[PDB]
Symmetry: C2
Subunit: 441 residues, 2 copies
Amino acid sequence: RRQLIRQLLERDKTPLAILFMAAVVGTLVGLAAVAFDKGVAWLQNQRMGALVHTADNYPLLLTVAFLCSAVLAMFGYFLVRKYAPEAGGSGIPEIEGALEDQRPVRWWRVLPVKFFGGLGTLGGGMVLGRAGPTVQIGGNIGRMVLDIFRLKGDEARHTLLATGAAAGLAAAFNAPLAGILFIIEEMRPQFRYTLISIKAVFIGVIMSTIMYRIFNHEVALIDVGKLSDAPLNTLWLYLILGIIFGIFGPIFNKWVLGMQDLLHRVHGGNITKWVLMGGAIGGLCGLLGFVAPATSGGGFNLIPIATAGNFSMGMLVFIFVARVITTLLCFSSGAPGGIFAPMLALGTVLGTAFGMVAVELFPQYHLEAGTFAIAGMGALLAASIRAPLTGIILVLEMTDNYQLILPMIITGLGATLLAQFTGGKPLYSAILARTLAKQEA
Amino acid sequence: RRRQLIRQLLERDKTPLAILFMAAVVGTLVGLAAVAFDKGVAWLQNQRMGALVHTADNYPLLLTVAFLCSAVLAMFGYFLVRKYAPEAGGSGIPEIEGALEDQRPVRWWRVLPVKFFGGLGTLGGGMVLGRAGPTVQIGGNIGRMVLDIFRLKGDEARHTLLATGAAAGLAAAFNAPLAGILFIIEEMRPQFRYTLISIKAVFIGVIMSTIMYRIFNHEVALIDVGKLSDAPLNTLWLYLILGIIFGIFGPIFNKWVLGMQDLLHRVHGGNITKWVLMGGAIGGLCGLLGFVAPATSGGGFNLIPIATAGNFSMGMLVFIFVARVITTLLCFSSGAPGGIFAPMLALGTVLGTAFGMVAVELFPQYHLEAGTFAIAGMGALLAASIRAPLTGIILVLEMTDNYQLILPMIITGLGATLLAQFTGGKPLYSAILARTLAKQEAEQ
């Protein structure tokens, strides 16, 4: 007891050196994030101009569309397989491992690998997000200054590694709160105590977000507008949607896991078969990005369009199925790039679908399908990743429809609850487990 | 420990179904309890206002029933605590924070009626105290109650249901679900070791509690500030400065609330009669001040939209601040059942607006709106004194709904916490639990 009375009076006294270093980590992760974003944009831009250069010969234009992405994909898979294999896929499981001191942070390798590697896969127009990449990059950034300035202690190692990962998500979504929440709900060691200074994570998230604001102000990633409210007697519809995501989550979770295996056979581990396959998948996305751009790319483009209800039911069913396919294909191939953001697009689409059915069945509720999209936007994040609080706060930060907080929380729970009751597991912890097991086998 | 991890990771987030169900029950009860408490405080505040109309001619007689009506209700509040549940005085958050460390008991059979009816007098009498603390402690005891009744066993169920109760309590007191859940994971839970508090279950309780509050209190917001203006990047440095100002004031305010507890303890020495009488004096003063200068008494929620809108003068802002600091310390450091959480929102809003006003005149090139500095500083005392910025920031965001000010709010909040640390300040809630834990061994 007297230990506590001594501990309480000493509470929240983070070492000033940690606080200062947190500020520099966040700043670097910020600029890094901004540069990554501007980079991906530029390559997506040139590819678009290349199709204009040949905007008459359809079979030819269908080729440079394929090749330009196929090449950039290959350059991505290659940079990973050759210099940093831990820089493939998401990057979040790896950093989550780092916090458990069960994986290494080879920043001298992963930073240029993840940055330029993702720069090719993303810039090529594959179904992957900036989320994971920037989170991993940020963690390595944090590890970098730790080494350079030679800060010692478990606290400094865990903290700077955390403020880096947090500041990374924040700069990739312009979502400060969501970044901080990710670390304390998901990223940090889930089964034991740790010395991660929250105050320091904050200092990093600010500076990172600030940097992002210096370069990307005036425009939002997702503008949905201010939608209608949700009557109390309409809330049960949100629980049902949550239950639908709740059973689909685990199923989607097996698919991403299983497809990693099936795609691993195609190359067996060989750097050449793999990279070549990467160009096949990546090249497919560049082609799909011209013949049906809704089935390829980040997916952020069709969120506002879905929410406004500008899609038909068929197009929604199409976009969903098509994106499930191209998401598994891209992420379970080992390419540098996350699944986080493309699940936002997947959730938004499924929600709008549910909302549309809801509108016709209940004209007495005066429904707007867009409200079920916003509820379901972070529902796949809740059912598959199993971090609902972060997903809910994230969507709130991006869509700014706070008057829908109750639907968003209820759908989010109905996902997480049924995800558990159907044997699903946190994807990020299921991957780190898969990786930690192949390590001791 | 690699192999335990692969085992643990695959077993992650599988909260026992019994705990998940009971979380829903706890939340619902905490909701109804909160709603009842709110409706009760309103009714008594209402009757007192009607009594002043009954004698709205004789000012000296008017100034008396204004005193007595609050003095009586205060005494009835101080009395219910001292006689039946001494741990139900003051905030209530330090005590529940103690419960999660298993260092304090949860005597729900006593505190529930004591805190409910006791605070119902102090708040309903119009003292400068909040629903926050009371509902949080009440909620925690509600949680412990169903734990005992249904005889759930295990550290996990104890800590969890005790936590979903405290969370659903803050949520129903502010109509702030996110802020309630965040409070548990940023502040409430044991800060120095591991614990088995299912977040998913805290959520289930927070939902149900907030839903219950929504059944009875829809259509109206506690704080309507409207959609203010945005904040340019070149204006951000002003928010860090405001944060630093709160940063040095927090710890100072922290000493005052602590020290005033001591100074007021001498006036009664521990005696139930001197204390209750002194409670009537303080409580009666608030009922009087509630008629002659209602801005210096009461919960304070009323003058937040007024301050933000810029409808006060700099003099009135200076008056309201000093006066409310005085009546806040007087009410909370007296041991009355009622928190300091909400009155610190009012104090923060006023100080922010004050800063905003000076900021507007000094910089017309920024095209400033003083209300943006109020919203920034609204959860800043919460950040500098309580040292839970993330909760305060999200809380204010939930109440004021001005998300386009998230950066100023975060930055001011940090400057508070950073300078609160660097000036030797301590978390108020932890500094009270320590004072209580120490006295519990001092008399041994």
